[PDB]
Amino acid sequence: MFINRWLFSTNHKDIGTLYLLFGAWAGMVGTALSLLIRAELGQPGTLLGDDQIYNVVVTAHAFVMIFFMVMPIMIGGFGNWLVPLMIGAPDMAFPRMNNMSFWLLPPSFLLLLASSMVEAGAGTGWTVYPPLAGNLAHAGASVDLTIFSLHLAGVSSILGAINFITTIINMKPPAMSQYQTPLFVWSVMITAVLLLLSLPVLAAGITMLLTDRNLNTTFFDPAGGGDPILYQHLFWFFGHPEVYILILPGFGMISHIVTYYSGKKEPFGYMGMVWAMMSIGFLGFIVWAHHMFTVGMDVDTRAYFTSATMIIAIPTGVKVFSWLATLHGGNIKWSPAMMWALGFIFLFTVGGLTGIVLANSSLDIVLHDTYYVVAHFHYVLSMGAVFAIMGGFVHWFPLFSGYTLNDTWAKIHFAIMFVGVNMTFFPQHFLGLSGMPRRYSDYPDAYTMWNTISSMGSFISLTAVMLMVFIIWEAFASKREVLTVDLTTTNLEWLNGCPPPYHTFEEPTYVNLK
Amino acid sequence: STALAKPQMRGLLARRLRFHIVGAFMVSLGFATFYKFAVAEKRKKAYADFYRNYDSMKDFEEMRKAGIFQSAK
Amino acid sequence: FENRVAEKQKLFQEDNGLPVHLKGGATDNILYRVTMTLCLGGTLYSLYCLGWASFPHK
Amino acid sequence: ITAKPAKTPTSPKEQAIGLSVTFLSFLLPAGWVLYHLDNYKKS
Amino acid sequence: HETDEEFDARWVTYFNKPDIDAWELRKGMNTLVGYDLVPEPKIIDAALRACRRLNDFASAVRILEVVKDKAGPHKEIYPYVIQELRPTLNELGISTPEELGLDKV
Amino acid sequence: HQTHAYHMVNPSPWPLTGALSALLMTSGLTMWFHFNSMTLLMIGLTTNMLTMYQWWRDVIRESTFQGHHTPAVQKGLRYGMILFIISEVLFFTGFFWAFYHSSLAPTPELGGCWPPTGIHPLNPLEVPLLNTSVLLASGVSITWAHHSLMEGDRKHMLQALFITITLGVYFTLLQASEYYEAPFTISDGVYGSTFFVATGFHGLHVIIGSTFLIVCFFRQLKFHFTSNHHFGFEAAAWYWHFVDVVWLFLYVSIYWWGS
Amino acid sequence: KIKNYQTAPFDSRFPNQNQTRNCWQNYLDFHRCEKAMTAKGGDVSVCEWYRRVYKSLCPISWVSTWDDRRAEGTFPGKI
Amino acid sequence: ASGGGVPTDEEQATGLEREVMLAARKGQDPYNILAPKATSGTKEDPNLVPSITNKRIVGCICEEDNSTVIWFWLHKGEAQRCPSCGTHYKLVPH
Amino acid sequence: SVVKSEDYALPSYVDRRDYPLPDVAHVKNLSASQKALKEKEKASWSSLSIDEKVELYRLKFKESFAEMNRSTNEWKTVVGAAMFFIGFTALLLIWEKHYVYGPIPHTFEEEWVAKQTKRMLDMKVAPIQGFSAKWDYDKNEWKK
Amino acid sequence: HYEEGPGKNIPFSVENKWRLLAMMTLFFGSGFAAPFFIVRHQLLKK
Amino acid sequence: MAYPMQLGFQDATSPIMEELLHFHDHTLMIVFLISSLVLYIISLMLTTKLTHTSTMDAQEVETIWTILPAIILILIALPSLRILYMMDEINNPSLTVKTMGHQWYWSYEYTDYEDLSFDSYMIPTSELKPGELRLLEVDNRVVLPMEMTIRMLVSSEDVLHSWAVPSLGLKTDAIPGRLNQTTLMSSRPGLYYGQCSEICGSNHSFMPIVLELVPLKYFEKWSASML
Amino acid sequence: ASAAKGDHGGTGARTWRFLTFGLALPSVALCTLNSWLHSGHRERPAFIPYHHLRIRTKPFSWGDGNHTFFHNPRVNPLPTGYEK
Amino acid sequence: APDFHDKYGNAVLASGATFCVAVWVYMATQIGIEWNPSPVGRVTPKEWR
Ligand code: HEA
Ligand SMILES: CCCCC/C=C\C/C=C/C/C=C\C/C=C\CCCC(=O)O[C@H](COC(=O)CCCCCCCCCCCCCCCCC)COP(=O)(O)OCCN
Ligand SMILES: CCCCCCCCCCO[C@@H]1O[C@H](CO)[C@@H](O[C@H]2O[C@H](CO)[C@@H](O)[C@H](O)[C@H]2O)[C@H](O)[C@H]1O
Ligand SMILES: CCCCCCCCCCO[C@@H]1O[C@H](CO)[C@@H](O[C@H]2O[C@H](CO)[C@@H](O)[C@H](O)[C@H]2O)[C@H](O)[C@H]1O
Ligand SMILES: C[C@H](CCC(=O)O)[C@H]1CC[C@H]2[C@@H]3[C@H](O)C[C@@H]4C[C@H](O)CC[C@]4(C)[C@H]3C[C@H](O)[C@]12C
Ligand SMILES: [C-]#N
Ligand code: CUA
Ligand SMILES: [Cu+2]
Ligand SMILES: [Mg+2]
Ligand code: NA
Ligand SMILES: [Zn+2]
């Protein structure tokens, strides 16, 4: 029974649970790697070794946080638990293929851990650029194990995208149009389209890297007429969509959280929110070379990519102001999930604005490959994607488990994390503007003050991560069972109780056309 | 004894919003003026003042005499 | 050839509680055991190979 | 949300135990490695 | 849309329906308090008399509480509304939340 | 009992065995490239084939033999197959991008010209044109097979599907011969790299598509398809047309324009 | 000779940040010219402008490698 | 040119596929493939909600093109009203 | 009174200031005296006593508005506990400085820094605003 | 078929909170420890 | 170079870097204004017991929410693109210098006249002279004439690197097989520092750039003495 | 385009069989004729050890590490030239 | 009836604040951390050459 249920699953809730457990374990790995980074940098000099061990840690930090924590938690975890419930469907379209999307991830993670154990690891950056990632400067198996880790993670997500798109298009009540599905369901559908189109291009590029390393091709090697910059285009054709994949399910969860704890039946401006997510998804495919403003592209290309990148602020601003307009007039419940979501609105806005700074190719000459970029993306990742994850986790934990968290502890956790992430990353703007490069294990002495403060901030975030584990233990230890949940008339995923039965919607909802 | 007067009872949230969005706008202007004066113009004037009578050869000779250069003793 | 789909429909709808991957009969169990043994054994072997590759040789 | 009182209440003493054990599970192994870094490098 | 007076009159008519049922009483009050306004005394008067016809003393008191709540920090609105309702309160024997001690935390 | 039309699938081991097969194939390629050994890779390829066989076997059991493919389920599988093909189009798009990047801006190492100095391309009017006629013809014959099936004509469905498969095999044999005869190799700089990786992934997809057609051929021999319900045939035909269209783009881009 | 060369002038054929082809073209032009001139009984001095430009723009290792490959018979540009 | 030998769905469909096919021929929708058409929704003329148990979830799209659906359990017994628009629904278990 | 997990699909009671009249009464079962009280409620409410009126309210509702809206001392616990855990973090940093970090480079020694500062001023590091602009070259001291 | 309800729809037991504490400690602690021990591994090599 | 506790950009040494400072000031004012407005509106939405929970019409307010940001973006893009095209303008250099990145140091070639080239390595911390800067000094500086337009050509002979000098507003990637061009013009004599700006392996942190800007006559004699 | 055929009254099985045997397979037969006609080995060119060809940055994982997967001795020189 | 925050909130606030300030002041000043503040107004420049 245990093996049938948990290794042979065809159930969207159990698979969602598996993803949440996997993502939480990955989050611990990713947190440890982040502390090793900040320990190396928290005083001038060398702690661990030279830049190879240092950038193996940096590279794994990024891959773990992106591919094994954020995407599994948002898409595999919250997506599998919530999407079928929110449309009244009895499971996903392909419930058995869904299970293989999950089980590809432990092997993917094993490959990544193997890459770091063999030889001297893959010290390449998560972008894996050649020639540093090629077979002369990174001889041996580490980069090939990284490539294969990405192949498996990509297959997992491509099949998952097929599943989500099919489920959301095909398995709604017959009276429900796409414009009657909740915003979180929209956010997952759009993320899935981005995954479907972008990951195959990454797969092509890293397969090219694999054959340059092992089959004597020369896609990226000038000696054979190849070009290192071609790899950068193929990687970033995926990589910019990827950051919208990391944030869009978060936007969906934020819409639901802000609506719920405002005591509203609906988000402000539903069709504008749909429009904004679609627009962001589309524009996110035509801007990738803003990751390449210093590689030597023609000026008119730089001007196009500056302008097209900046226009993404318009649909994103509609979402920010619509969240504010959802709060407006609300009966505000100051729950811990609401605190995460309010932190998200502000700190995501700050990070998105420094992204607009970076979109200016002229200024990006000085900011590129500096900590200003690191500050931008951790505002939108540690204070954006992660704040949406924590808000969603706190909000829906009682649904998934049937038990309540201690809200006072959860507010304490939010407070500690909020201090920690801002102490970590706010000073990195100063380090970037004053010219500290990325991917450095040590820095000129002038940069010492802000690196010391940033490292102290990272230890505060460690304390918050440790406290989160205790808080989850305390909830399962005390077993306070849920009774009543408000606002079920506009939050269908709660209407089958907490936790919902293994099979829900065996008899579908009744919705007439009218 | 006297009756209480009828107060405004409708649109209290909207009235509050209107008043404070206006206030936010006026402050935004006040801050933009402060910033152009305290930051942007300060910088333009610092660079223009610095270069207005700047003598690059005199600067070089000072540096050279301090011993900073490989190419100039 | 003759159309024997009806016979297969009877077999795979027999009310015996078997999951579809075993419902064909004892051959399914054998092929399942072979597949799972190769997968689990091969995975242990891959872990051994990691162990081996994680340390310098000579 | 409303909920039942805890079926298995976790007293303050019990929470102090769970919290201490949780923190030590993170801090002792990493602290052991970091304490012995020089032994690893200076070798 | 419609004038204030047209709005107030629709709501008075709603609660004045002689055979208004319990569901319609709750639907009306729970809808009304979603708007950006404190209901006019004449609306509250009609809702209280609907409570009387439904033999529901407790909901009459609750309606008085929600009037105070919808006024937010505008502390002058609730005493005004109670003042305007005192003939109805006296006629129907409705005690205010304050007279019942239900304003104590 | 359910009162929706969707398929609650029995708990299955094949997702786990497929995921483990992916671990064994990738760690196996690593062992082959770096530790001189094919053992893991061979186990992985074997478990992958076993997984694919039992998984799709079970889908046939669930549909032909158990009746779970209602119209709603079939419609989902149509979307699934279309989306899968789209992902495969984007995979090939990356290799076309690599080809055009390198050929439109030939670097000094190549002679600053395309084709590179020292490369003697195949004549696109010889076996490459023959291969084009072969796959185009097979798109006509698979369309005949589809209409025969819809019209309830068992014998001509089988004849047309056999001709389609024969043409897929002919393409594969011709392409294998061309690979052997080609005077340039995958190690002949970016010309050989783009040529063999792009046409090689295409050849793999011809083999996959031909296998899928063969599965359909034997299911047809066993009377699985009705004149109205035959999604596996439809999916194989869609995949086959995708393989044909990718070939036409390779022929125009790499063999003709790139010569 | 319309000299006083300081460095290679702006060349409208190569107006962008990537100057690889500017180095390459002037290297080819110099050696093409030198081939013509040595051949027909003429003076390589007429080729001098291309020589100065490619020597200004081209990395030493590129010139060195291209020279080696011309000596070996493996230079892939047409001269 | 043309011949036979391909089974039809009438001959060979089985299981749930066959149940759906046969019910559709009869104009019946036991597996909820179609959207029900609303009645006027008064207490006299409530929307009739079939169920194989004593409660079913209703979603009410109160007005055409609303994006918000209002969800609630409908129980066997007296008709219930959508909490947003008041339109009436009555369970018809079978 | 007692709410049960198996009741999740039934109309439920809630105290929310924006949903003043919930879907069910707080108390559904009535004792003999409570029944008699509901009968008396059908007569003039002027004849109900204050206590009877309170009892009717508390049969219908759980908490009053004032009760459901009350503030709490929870912020003291949250802020105080958060400061405790932030304080605990500094213990980790003290441990790290003591047992993990070795000496920092010799370039932070006071004499080194004094010489390096002079050399920065000699090469006029950031002479417009950032650094040497803050040095008075005429008076040979930091500007006031 | 399977157990339903709080504490039953998860692959780990919550029947005893102290056994649970141990399991959660091993689970989250092993993920957090792994990078430190890989760093140790890479340092001890060379 | 950067100095302790620095918050913003290194002081400008070139006219283009001064342009970038003023453009950054303009854009940061906008960033601060929008961030502060969002924080303020958040606090405004959260500080009243007044409620309005019925459906709200979105159409009118979304015109403001799209048109005002579009105007702001245009007000950023215009000066942004002006500077972009300025940086691209034809300028007629007096000198061309090449730099090749390597693991882990830079080489420099000045081959307009003579074949002058040399390697430039970080000074190890243990060998710094008193008052020299840890991780920033090199053994052989890139001596260049001040007040003159210089064409810098950048490439690599191994992996990617990137050649940066923040105070001149310069960062050009060093890509094998590719010759990237930038222009350099220092308004002042002095010493201007940069650091390798593309991850390049074990000693990426430890291959810095030091430009030494002096009068032409000193540059000429230094060049001759380096042959 | 309409190409130059006709029919479109009923695109059915009979029409697609007509296209298969009347257009598609004759085209294959023509191109097969054309191909097995220009076949026969063209003469291999002088070997020149161009550095952008015969790339070897890592030995191949088969054979002696120096032979491509479908190495044809007649037309594929090694980095050192044609095989004997 | 008084809850945990009524009974202990004041003490948690006071003790937490006191502990937090004390330990961060100690860490910042007593254990040899090099903050590398600006030399401006602080360092007397000394001859180096
Ligand atoms: C969740 C992740 C995430 C998200 C959502 C984003 C969102 C954005 N990012 Fe970012 N980014 C990263 C993660 C993310 N980014 C990462 C990881 C990197 C580094 C990659 C690597 O090199 O490793 C990076 C790097 C990166 C660069 C490359 C810089 C360089 O390397 O030199 C650029 C350049 O244009 C960029 C820009 C943007 C912009 C314009 C947005 C926009 O989508 C933001 C839009 C949001 C707003 C603007 C705020 C809300 C709007 C309003 C309140 C309306 C009014 C606003 C205005 C009028 C301006 N990002
Ligand atoms: C006949 C038509 C079809 C042919 C297919 C034959 C076998 C190849 C299998 C197909 C895989 C396709 C792409 C693999 C990449 C390269 C193979 C390209 C096609 C091919 O077969 O290329 C051959 C070289 O093969 C080599 O190196 C062979 C290398 C053998 C190892 C295969 C590659 C191993 C790595 C595979 C990585 C797969 C990554 C998958 C990513 C999926 C992501 C979602 C060409 O032979 P040659 O002697 O150089 O020149 C001919 C000279 N007379
Ligand atoms: C039940 C599920 C299935 C579980 C599968 C477990 C299989 C384990 C068998 C491994 O055998 C090893 O294989 C190595 C490589 O395969 C051999 O190395 C050899 O292999 C190379 C390849 O032929 C030679 O070239 C090398 O000299 C030599 O080291 C080596 O003798 C042997 O120890
Ligand atoms: C970034 C994540 C971690 C950052 C913060 C870690 C906080 C440290 C927690 C304590 O870790 C322990 O510290 C002891 C020292 O206090 C070490 O004992 C070591 O030192 C002792 C005292 O000198 C000896 O008694 C022991 O034998 C010797 O192992 C011990 O091994 C280690 O587990
Ligand atoms: C025996 C069988 C009749 C099928 C059935 O009615 O049972 C016939 C009908 C169609 C035949 C196939 C088709 O005519 C196409 C192929 C023609 C080749 O000449 C032989 C194999 C070939 C694949 C045939 C095998 C066999 O004779 C088939 C399959
Ligand atoms: C941003 N990417
Ligand atoms: Cu060179 Cu980094
Ligand atoms: Cu991007
Ligand atoms: Mg870079
Ligand atoms: Na360090
Ligand atoms: Zn309704």
Numbering used by the authors:
A (entry chain A): 1 to 514
B (entry chain I): 1 to 73
C (entry chain J): 1 to 58
D (entry chain M): 1 to 43
E (entry chain E): 5 to 109
F (entry chain C): 3 to 261
G (entry chain H): 7 to 85
H (entry chain F): 1 to 94
Question: Which passages does the manuscript contain on this structure?
Answer:
pmcMammalian cytochrome c oxidase (CcO), as the terminal oxidase of cell respiration, reduces molecular oxygen (O2) to water, coupled with a proton pump across the enzyme molecule from the matrix side (N-side) to the intermembrane side (P-side) to create a proton gradient across the mitochondrial inner membrane. Electrons for reducing O2 are transferred from cytochrome c in the P-side to the O2-reduction site, including heme a3 (Fea3) and CuB via the two low-potential sites, CuA and heme a (Fea), while protons for making water molecules from the fully reduced O2 (i.e., 2O2-) to 2H2O are transferred to the O2-reduction site from the N-side via two proton-conducting pathways, D and K as described in Figure 1. In this paper, the cyanide-bound fully-oxidized, mixed valence (three electron-reduced), and fully reduced (four-electron reduced) forms are abbreviated as CNox, CNmv, and CNred, respectively. X-ray crystal structures of cyanide-bound CcOs under various oxidation states showed that the O2-reduction site controlled only the Ser382-including site, while the low-potential metal sites induced the other changes.
The inset shows a magnified view of the ligands of both structures, where O1 and O2 denote the oxygen atoms of a peroxide anion ligated to Fea3 and CuB, respectively, in the fully-oxidized form. These atomic distances and the superimposed structures (Supporting Texts 6, 1.) indicate that the ligation structures of the CNox are identical to those of the fully-oxidized form except for the bond distances of the CN- and peroxide ligands. No structural difference between the two forms was detectable in the structures other than the O2-reduction site. The cyanide ligand of the CNmv coordinated to Fea3 in an essentially straight fashion, in contrast to the bent fashion in the CN- ligand of the CNox. The P, F, O, E, and CNox, which show their heme a3 at the location identical to that of the fully-oxidized form, provide the water channel of the fully-oxidized form.
